Amino acid sequence: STTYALSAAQTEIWLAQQLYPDSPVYNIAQYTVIEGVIEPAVFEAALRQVIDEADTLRLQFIDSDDGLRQRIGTPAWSMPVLDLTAQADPQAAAQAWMRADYQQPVNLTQGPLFCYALLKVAPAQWMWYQRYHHIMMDGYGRYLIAQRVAYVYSALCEGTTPAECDFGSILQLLESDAQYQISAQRAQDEAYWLKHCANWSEPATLASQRLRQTTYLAIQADARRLAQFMTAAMAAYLYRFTGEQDVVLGLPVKVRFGADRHIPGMKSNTLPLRLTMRPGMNLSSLMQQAAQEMQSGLRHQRYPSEALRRQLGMPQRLFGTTVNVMPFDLDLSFGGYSATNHNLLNGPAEDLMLGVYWTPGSHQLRIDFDANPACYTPEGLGAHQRRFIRFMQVLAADATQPIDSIDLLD
């Protein structure tokens, strides 16, 4: 049958998993707590329909004489139904079962790349467990699969047939990438990114399993320009703390190649953003420089960052900090009962990841620091978060004030 090549990121994930077969670092996990009753047969039927709809769950990765390939197959899976109403601590028992699952390493060749389970923790409260592998799923695809599961289960439980899928097939992305691999546009993007990152520097970093610290706040001062402001603020903070005038940040971009719908499993492309800190620069100048730099690499955004890393002299990172500004995911409804999503495991740490979560029509922001434990301590991460948030509030208070004259308090 038709086999397809792995992306550079998928190849790196495969190689790192084979080098450390005992590490469950590539496992992505979450659970949906549903306040009500669930019919498990209908849920399994919906799970099976969406598995065939989000066919990235049907992907099989082989290592044949051709090389490391991927193809659409029929994966063998099961949906266990657990009852914890008789346990002394039902929620703790569900947490223990989920932790027993997502802490097991998974063999990529022939082993279940996803695991679906249902856990009854109360007479009117269930827990839908979802575990994937990083080689075929990200966070947004995870939420989209959960949402489609909720919709299809609700449709099947109240008789009506579910409306058509609004996902594209993963093979659309596979064919698009196969054509782009031999494109002249890819050669142009490669040349541009090798010229733009020519020589360069050490990534300005605060580097000194995953460490996660959350802070809530509201500030006196739109998603695109909130991302602009957060990028400029983190770059200025790195410049003020490390003393580096050339700061490189990672900015994930949803690559657009003509796909009408979203394809679960289609990863983002984290592009390096180079920002130069000249003396006497304010937040206005830094934000406009960031906008111009994002515009300069806009037509070249499809070149994968892993290829740019490997095609350079890197054994090992273009950037130490990535900035992710995204709204909160909408809460879900199963049949008619409420359900909230709760994260268990996400992608492994690339040094430091800054997540900025905002809600429409409100001033409140949520700031998440997801750091690599080998280069950050909890106390250091907390001090960095506090200092950065205070410095960012000072920035937002006056966009014309020079960054050099801002007090960096600890």
Residue numbers in the entry: 7 to 214, 222 to 234, 241 to 334, 337 to 431
The authors write:
Nonribosomal peptide synthetases (NRPSs) are multimodular enzymes that catalyze the biosynthesis of diverse peptides with a wide variety of activities. The incorporation of an acyl into peptidyl backbone is usually implemented by a starter condensation (Cs) domain, normally located at the beginning of the initial NRPS module, via the formation of an amide bond to the α-amino group of the first amino acid residue, a process also known as lipoinitiation. Genome mining of two Cs domain-embedded cryptic NRPS biosynthetic gene clusters, rzmA and holA, in the bacterium P. rhizoxinica HKI 454 resulted in the discovery of two distinct types of lipopeptides, cyclic rhizomide A (1) containing an uncommon acetyl chain (C2) and linear holrhizin A (2) harboring a medium octanoyl (C8) chain. Similar to other C domain structures reported previously, RzmA-Cs adopts a “V-shaped” configuration and consists of two subdomains (N- and C-lobes) each representing the chloramphenicol acetyltransferase (CAT) fold.
Despite our successful purification of the dissected Cs domains of both RzmA and HolA, we were able to obtain crystals only for RzmA-Cs, and solved its structure at 2.3 Å in the P1 space group. Interestingly, in each asymmetric unit there are four molecules of RzmA-Cs with two different conformations. The overall structures of the two conformations are quite similar (RMSD = 1.52 Å for Cα), especially when the two lobes are compared separately (RMSD = 0.68 Å and 1.30 Å for Cα of the N- and C-lobes). The major difference comes from the relative positions of the two lobes (i.e., opening angles of the “V” as shown in Fig. 5c). Among a small group of candidate residues, R148 of RzmA (corresponding to A149 of HolA and M165 of CdaPS1) caught our attention. This residue not only sits near the proposed binding pocket for the 2,3-epoxyhexanoyl chain of CDA in the CdaPS1 structure, but also fits well with the simple logic that a longer side-chain of pocket residue would correlate with a shorter substrate chain, and vice versa (i.e., R148 with C2, M165 with C6, and A149 with C8).
